[PDB]
Amino acid sequence: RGADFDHVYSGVVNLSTENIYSFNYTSQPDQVTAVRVYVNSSSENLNYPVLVVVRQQKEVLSWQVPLLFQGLYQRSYNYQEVSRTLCPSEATNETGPLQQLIFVDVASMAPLGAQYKLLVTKLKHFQLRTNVAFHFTASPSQPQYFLYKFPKDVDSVIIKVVSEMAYPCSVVSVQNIMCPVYDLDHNVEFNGVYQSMTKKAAITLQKKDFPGEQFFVVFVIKPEDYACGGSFFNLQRKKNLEVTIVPSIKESVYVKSSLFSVFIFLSFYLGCLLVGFVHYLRFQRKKYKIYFWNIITIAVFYALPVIQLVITYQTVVNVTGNQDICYYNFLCAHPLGVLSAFNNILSNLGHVLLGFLFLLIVLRRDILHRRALEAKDIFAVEYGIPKHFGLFYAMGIALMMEGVLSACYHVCPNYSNFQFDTSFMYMIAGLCMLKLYQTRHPDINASAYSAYASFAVVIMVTVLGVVFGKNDVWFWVIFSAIHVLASLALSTQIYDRMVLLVVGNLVNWSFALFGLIYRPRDFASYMLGIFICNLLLYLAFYIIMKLRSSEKVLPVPLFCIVATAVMWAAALYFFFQNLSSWEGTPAESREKNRECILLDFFDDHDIWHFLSATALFFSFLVLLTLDDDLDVVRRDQIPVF
Amino acid sequence: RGADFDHVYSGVVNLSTENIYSFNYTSQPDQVTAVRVYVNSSSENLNYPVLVVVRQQKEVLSWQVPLLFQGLYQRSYNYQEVSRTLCPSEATNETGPLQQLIFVDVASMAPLGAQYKLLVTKLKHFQLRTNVAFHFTASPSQPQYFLYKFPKDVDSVIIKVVSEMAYPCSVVSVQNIMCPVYDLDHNVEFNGVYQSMTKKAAITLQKKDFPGEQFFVVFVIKPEDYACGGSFFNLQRKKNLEVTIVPSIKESVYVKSSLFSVFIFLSFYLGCLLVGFVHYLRFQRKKYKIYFWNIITIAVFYALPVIQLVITYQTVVNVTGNQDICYYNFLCAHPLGVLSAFNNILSNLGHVLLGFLFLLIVLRRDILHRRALEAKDIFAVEYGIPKHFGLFYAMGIALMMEGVLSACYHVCPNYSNFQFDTSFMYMIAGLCMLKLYQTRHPDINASAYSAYASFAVVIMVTVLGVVFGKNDVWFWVIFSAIHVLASLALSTQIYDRMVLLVVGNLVNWSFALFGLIYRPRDFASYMLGIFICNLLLYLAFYIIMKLRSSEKVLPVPLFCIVATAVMWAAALYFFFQNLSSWEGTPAESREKNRECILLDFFDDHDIWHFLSATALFFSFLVLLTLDDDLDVVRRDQIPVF
Ligand SMILES: CC(C)CCC[C@@H](C)[C@H]1CC[C@H]2[C@@H]3CC=C4C[C@@H](O)CC[C@]4(C)[C@H]3CC[C@]12C
Ligand SMILES: CC(C)CCC[C@@H](C)[C@H]1CC[C@H]2[C@@H]3CC=C4C[C@@H](O)CC[C@]4(C)[C@H]3CC[C@]12C
Ligand SMILES: CC(C)CCC[C@@H](C)[C@H]1CC[C@H]2[C@@H]3CC=C4C[C@@H](O)CC[C@]4(C)[C@H]3CC[C@]12C
Ligand SMILES: CC(C)CCC[C@@H](C)[C@H]1CC[C@H]2[C@@H]3CC=C4C[C@@H](O)CC[C@]4(C)[C@H]3CC[C@]12C
Ligand SMILES: CC(C)CCC[C@@H](C)[C@H]1CC[C@H]2[C@@H]3CC=C4C[C@@H](O)CC[C@]4(C)[C@H]3CC[C@]12C
Ligand SMILES: CC(C)CCC[C@@H](C)[C@H]1CC[C@H]2[C@@H]3CC=C4C[C@@H](O)CC[C@]4(C)[C@H]3CC[C@]12C
Ligand SMILES: CC(C)CCC[C@@H](C)[C@H]1CC[C@H]2[C@@H]3CC=C4C[C@@H](O)CC[C@]4(C)[C@H]3CC[C@]12C
Ligand SMILES: CC(C)CCC[C@@H](C)[C@H]1CC[C@H]2[C@@H]3CC=C4C[C@@H](O)CC[C@]4(C)[C@H]3CC[C@]12C
Ligand SMILES: CCCCCCCC/C=C\CCCCCCCC(=O)O
Ligand SMILES: CCCCCCCC/C=C\CCCCCCCC(=O)O
Ligand code: NA
Ligand SMILES: [Zn+2]
Ligand SMILES: [Zn+2]
């Protein structure tokens, strides 16, 4: 029967009568037309569903109305309105105008007839345009997909899908232009790239991956919300979606950002060179060695698991096309070669460059001291605090190792990797507190085993607390007992000294209270703030004790105190901007994704990598230079606190 | 049109003519009938395919002939014969006999008519019986599935599928009894458990998982062999398959095997008790302490990555139903609780029980030595070899830590976990060689860091060689250089002594040559044989040097030598029986799965865990007791080699 587009057809189908409709249309060359078939049935009997068959030249598509979904825990869902887009045939210029015919056959085996309504329409907005936002709606029984053709200049695009509400949750899949299109929840993840989506989704594609420089963006709504961190839930679950296809940054942005990263850090090298030059002009005109290596060994022992894991996770993402596995920022994930997010790795360059600079600065001090000790300078031998540079070498190397470990985490950030980003800073903050204590008490043995053992136990507490003590009121109660007791014990060792000890313990008790009351899910970041607080508290205690003892703070140490405080306040702010959350579902993390802040390449977490290295670098300089005033004062006179 | 079952229908379909067939059958209660629809079209034009629609009461099924598959690297496959089993409806006794009607509609849009052949048949062997082998055939375009109902007495079954040839490779999926059945490669992995299969597959199921105590066993043949370690490849890819449903072992087998494992090892405790009792009757009638703890720290540092990984892999297996992720011996993987293969973890009880026994043996001699020294015994003080039991405590605790590390690996053995099965044995073999050298050269410092560092570097070489040096002629050439040079340097320090050194280098050179020519993919096991070989060579050198120096081998040490040699020969044999291979694909590894050898619970790899612990336990006793004859001899008179 000849039928018209955009015309709603009603009918009753029983065993005897089947209703057939014929739609003929012409597709002009270089023009793609998609036909959407909508059938709905208001029939109580699901024992006798309305069966819809759409036959085209090269394909037959069949479905049933009401569409039934099997839910978790034996939940049943039925969708009375079912809509499908028929795979489009694109006429090349050579083929010419193509006359195509669609047959929509409607049948039912019901003894009394079952009613249905049919609307077949042509999609006027099937093709998606660049930098244009398109708003649409999808349902579990009404999946939608659209066509995008890569423009010549554009060699890569990002697919940004936004929703106002978290649920129902969807799947955004990118597939090549070949029939069939997998737009059902039972085959959508078979082919191509896909992401789970509650509120936001971002898929980055390259032209070389797709033949014909075109793809289909498929939007499938799940009958239930379980895979996307939701409780559950026969009635329309319409999701209002907006999708925009934006070109990615050009290769020039990669060059400008890599140069910027190296240059800000190399600027520090120039600044150290200028200071060194002034001393050279003045000169002409006028806790051990197994520690540098130990930090390496500990880092390598710790790097091996993550690196082996990276391979396997990277493998599974590439094959399955599951962008769910790695918790990238997505909105600012910039790919170089294999790396999905090169920008994250590049941000860790400062840790390596700044850590290296520190080793060179420490070395000059060691070489100069050693030369002075040989010359038997009175000041080198008997004036000032005895100088040991071993912990300083470990600190510099640890900063570099932190950069490498953080970069490894960023190859695939996820639940198995969560610790590695900020963990080595527990070692960095731990080493810095020994250097403070060793300054006055240079008699502390400090075995290599003790560092390795402490790190292992601290990480053991960290990983165990995240996995098994996620939010339990029990775990946080026990941990608060250790935290407070550790603070009491430490305070008595490292420490008006009494008033300072009270302030010192109180800050730790306050932190324990915040943790107990708030129960943060990110125990790794909470554990990190425990080491940062105690590092800054002991550093502040040292400065206060230095002032009460009338010891001076020279301009070079004093500037580093201001820079350390300013950089720590700035770095912590960018640390508190959560752009992805491995504790939640992949769809929940993606709601936190943001467009990146600096040079269109670096996000808030990238700035935290720049500023954490600079804050840690300037913290090293405070320890290195603070007691340089005493170099004139006799060691005998020098007090001990 | 009324049509007959098991009758082949021919017809020509053009735009004008569609051919419709009606098949009616009666399903008796408590009787399941499945109908298979076969359509084959020998039509050159794939632009105009034959479209087949099979409509039933509940659902409608449609497909096209020839069936087209999109292959990797743009390969195209077409199958003129397509066959499908229609979702059976099971009549309960209450419903009674049910008269069901099937409509098979055949259509084509070809201008000249396209021929087809149709056979609709009822499957007389749809239901699978217990302990009965059923042989069938499946094709990429002709998937098959069958029904199994759990017997009342049987609470769990294993699905064993066997094929004579590796390719074409298949997917065996287990799904609940609900329509639709996902029997296509684009939806087979959506629901239920599934395994990839080349030659063998084994799926273990429990009755509690399935409602109705029934499931579908779905067999889907892949159009290509890539996922199963093979290459490409329009023509039938028929796979002859045999599937048997066998009940799993009863809970009594779990109890009898757990008791056996504890008892053989506790028997050793009784044997040590009997020896201790005889000495107590005789008595009445007449390289340091930071090492025990260090091995713990190293093991914990090493246990943390694997344990965190276990959680995430175990998660993904449970959700997706993908049995391909872990590399168990599925033919004897027995589950207890959350563990998929409990027998693999129980087999590691020998390490902890025999490692604990050795610590009690060392402790006695440590206590009796200190008690003597307190009593100023002449023989304890000036006769015999200086006694340092510190490395014995490390060896005993390392054996325990190897049992827990090997048990953690067997929670989910895979490519990310490879090292954990045998890596700590490198530590054990290395500790045992230091104890040998420390015996006649008591003045060796042996720092804790050195053990940790050596382990880290040795594992770094092991993991790097497996991942990046899989079979390269380059990597094995460099490694043979280190292996020859390391053994050449070691031979000079520890080793007619000259003839022995020559024999000692030839064995290492031979091992290197075997590796160089053979290029084993399992570098972890090859690395293990390097440590075992040198441990037994240095042990044999010590015995030979003991005999040439006219020093006796007492009966207790001498028995341990025989037991160590016999157990090492026996353990190595069960080590060479590869029942699973993480280096290959999951389907390739399943080809080596075997039914398990001992008590219907333990396979060849489980026996290697029993015998490796016993060989390592008796190796410890050789070191502990060998020089107990020198206790009467004065320390000065004792030679050093
Ligand atoms: C690994 C990171 C967290 C740094 C850890 C530093 C701390 C926790 C480690 C490193 C050095 C260690 C100390 C080394 C020296 C001594 C003095 C000794 O008589 C008692 C142990 C004690 C007090 C150790 C306590 C723990 C210790 C302070
Ligand atoms: C905060 C972390 C990272 C670093 C803390 C350094 C701590 C662990 C170190 C530095 C100084 C050390 C103390 C130095 C002096 C003494 C006195 C001695 O009779 C007992 C050990 C004791 C009490 C040490 C315990 C460990 C100690 C307190
Ligand atoms: C988790 C937070 C709140 C507390 C962390 C406590 C950690 C840093 C403390 C508690 C127990 C400590 C260990 C106690 C025992 C030893 C042996 C000794 O040779 C010093 C190192 C070592 C290994 C200590 C390292 C530091 C240590 C692990
Ligand atoms: C704020 C937290 C992380 C600091 C934890 C470090 C402090 C409290 C821990 C770490 C290592 C611990 C020390 C480990 C070993 C010794 C030597 C022993 O003879 C006295 C106790 C003493 C000195 C412990 C005191 C508490 C201790 C110093
Ligand atoms: C895993 C295996 C190789 C462990 C073997 C450990 C023992 C047997 C080996 C490994 C390192 C070796 C030592 C390496 C360096 C020296 C310093 C030299 O001036 C005397 C010999 C001595 C002390 C060697 C003795 C033998 C030695 C201790
Ligand atoms: C089987 C082959 C690959 C093993 C080779 C191991 C070699 C390369 C590694 C493993 C253990 C390592 C040693 C561990 C202990 C020490 C003592 C330390 O004070 C200096 C480094 C030194 C000397 C290391 C040198 C390199 C080393 C000998
Ligand atoms: C752990 C597995 C992989 C192998 C273990 C090897 C251990 C036991 C061996 C291998 C390398 C050896 C060290 C190599 C370096 C030296 C030289 C000298 O300065 C003291 C002995 C010492 C420190 C050796 C001690 C024993 C040692 C650490
Ligand atoms: C694999 C078989 C052959 C055993 C391997 C023995 C290795 C681990 C042993 C044997 C010879 C040893 C080396 C001999 C020479 C030295 C002394 C000093 O310069 C540092 C340790 C170092 C470098 C040793 C490291 C460990 C060593 C390389
Ligand atoms: C004197 C104060 C020193 C600095 C204290 C810092 C306090 C940090 C405490 C933990 C907060 C963790 C919860 C929210 C942060 C999440 C980290 C992230 O977004 O990646
Ligand atoms: C004197 C000889 C001492 C013992 C030497 C043992 C030799 C072992 C060498 C490596 C063989 C590795 C290749 C095949 C074994 C695979 C291990 C496995 O099946 O799990
Ligand atoms: Na099913
Ligand atoms: Zn980071
Ligand atoms: Zn094992």
mmCIF file with all atom_site columns, C-alpha atoms and ligand atoms in Angstrom, chain B residues 450 453-454 457-458 482 527 531, ligand 6:
data_model
loop_
_atom_site.group_PDB
_atom_site.id
_atom_site.type_symbol
_atom_site.label_atom_id
_atom_site.label_alt_id
_atom_site.label_comp_id
_atom_site.label_asym_id
_atom_site.label_entity_id
_atom_site.label_seq_id
_atom_site.pdbx_PDB_ins_code
_atom_site.Cartn_x
_atom_site.Cartn_y
_atom_site.Cartn_z
_atom_site.occupancy
_atom_site.B_iso_or_equiv
_atom_site.pdbx_formal_charge
_atom_site.auth_seq_id
_atom_site.auth_comp_id
_atom_site.auth_asym_id
_atom_site.auth_atom_id
_atom_site.pdbx_PDB_model_num
ATOM   1  C CA  . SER B 1 450 ? 71.188 -5.319  49.239 1.00 0.00 ? 450 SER B CA  1
ATOM   2  C CA  . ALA B 1 453 ? 67.766 -3.965  45.775 1.00 0.00 ? 453 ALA B CA  1
ATOM   3  C CA  . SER B 1 454 ? 68.797 -7.263  44.236 1.00 0.00 ? 454 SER B CA  1
ATOM   4  C CA  . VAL B 1 457 ? 66.583 -5.472  39.930 1.00 0.00 ? 457 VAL B CA  1
ATOM   5  C CA  . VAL B 1 458 ? 66.143 -9.202  39.286 1.00 0.00 ? 458 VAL B CA  1
ATOM   6  C CA  . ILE B 1 482 ? 74.970 -10.997 31.377 1.00 0.00 ? 482 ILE B CA  1
ATOM   7  C CA  . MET B 1 527 ? 64.800 -17.185 35.263 1.00 0.00 ? 527 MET B CA  1
ATOM   8  C CA  . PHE B 1 531 ? 68.404 -19.812 40.394 1.00 0.00 ? 531 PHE B CA  1
HETATM 9  C C1  . LIG C 2 .   ? 70.867 -13.316 37.339 1.00 0.00 ? 6   LIG C C1  1
HETATM 10 C C2  . LIG C 2 .   ? 71.506 -11.942 37.197 1.00 0.00 ? 6   LIG C C2  1
HETATM 11 C C3  . LIG C 2 .   ? 70.716 -11.084 36.218 1.00 0.00 ? 6   LIG C C3  1
HETATM 12 C C4  . LIG C 2 .   ? 71.617 -11.258 38.553 1.00 0.00 ? 6   LIG C C4  1
HETATM 13 C C5  . LIG C 2 .   ? 72.419 -9.966  38.468 1.00 0.00 ? 6   LIG C C5  1
HETATM 14 C C6  . LIG C 2 .   ? 72.194 -9.142  39.728 1.00 0.00 ? 6   LIG C C6  1
HETATM 15 C C7  . LIG C 2 .   ? 73.036 -7.871  39.759 1.00 0.00 ? 6   LIG C C7  1
HETATM 16 C C8  . LIG C 2 .   ? 73.103 -7.204  38.392 1.00 0.00 ? 6   LIG C C8  1
HETATM 17 C C9  . LIG C 2 .   ? 72.476 -6.929  40.815 1.00 0.00 ? 6   LIG C C9  1
HETATM 18 C C10 . LIG C 2 .   ? 71.526 -7.682  41.747 1.00 0.00 ? 6   LIG C C10 1
HETATM 19 C C11 . LIG C 2 .   ? 71.914 -7.315  43.176 1.00 0.00 ? 6   LIG C C11 1
HETATM 20 C C12 . LIG C 2 .   ? 72.733 -6.051  42.990 1.00 0.00 ? 6   LIG C C12 1
HETATM 21 C C13 . LIG C 2 .   ? 73.652 -5.656  44.124 1.00 0.00 ? 6   LIG C C13 1
HETATM 22 C C14 . LIG C 2 .   ? 72.875 -5.546  45.417 1.00 0.00 ? 6   LIG C C14 1
HETATM 23 C C15 . LIG C 2 .   ? 73.855 -5.154  46.485 1.00 0.00 ? 6   LIG C C15 1
HETATM 24 C C16 . LIG C 2 .   ? 74.868 -4.311  46.242 1.00 0.00 ? 6   LIG C C16 1
HETATM 25 C C17 . LIG C 2 .   ? 75.645 -3.789  47.422 1.00 0.00 ? 6   LIG C C17 1
HETATM 26 C C18 . LIG C 2 .   ? 75.575 -2.272  47.393 1.00 0.00 ? 6   LIG C C18 1
HETATM 27 O O1  . LIG C 2 .   ? 76.355 -1.745  48.470 1.00 0.00 ? 6   LIG C O1  1
HETATM 28 C C19 . LIG C 2 .   ? 76.136 -1.804  46.054 1.00 0.00 ? 6   LIG C C19 1
HETATM 29 C C20 . LIG C 2 .   ? 75.312 -2.330  44.881 1.00 0.00 ? 6   LIG C C20 1
HETATM 30 C C21 . LIG C 2 .   ? 75.264 -3.854  44.855 1.00 0.00 ? 6   LIG C C21 1
HETATM 31 C C22 . LIG C 2 .   ? 76.647 -4.403  44.523 1.00 0.00 ? 6   LIG C C22 1
HETATM 32 C C23 . LIG C 2 .   ? 74.286 -4.317  43.782 1.00 0.00 ? 6   LIG C C23 1
HETATM 33 C C24 . LIG C 2 .   ? 74.971 -4.384  42.412 1.00 0.00 ? 6   LIG C C24 1
HETATM 34 C C25 . LIG C 2 .   ? 74.074 -4.935  41.299 1.00 0.00 ? 6   LIG C C25 1
HETATM 35 C C26 . LIG C 2 .   ? 73.513 -6.283  41.718 1.00 0.00 ? 6   LIG C C26 1
HETATM 36 C C27 . LIG C 2 .   ? 74.643 -7.282  41.950 1.00 0.00 ? 6   LIG C C27 1
#
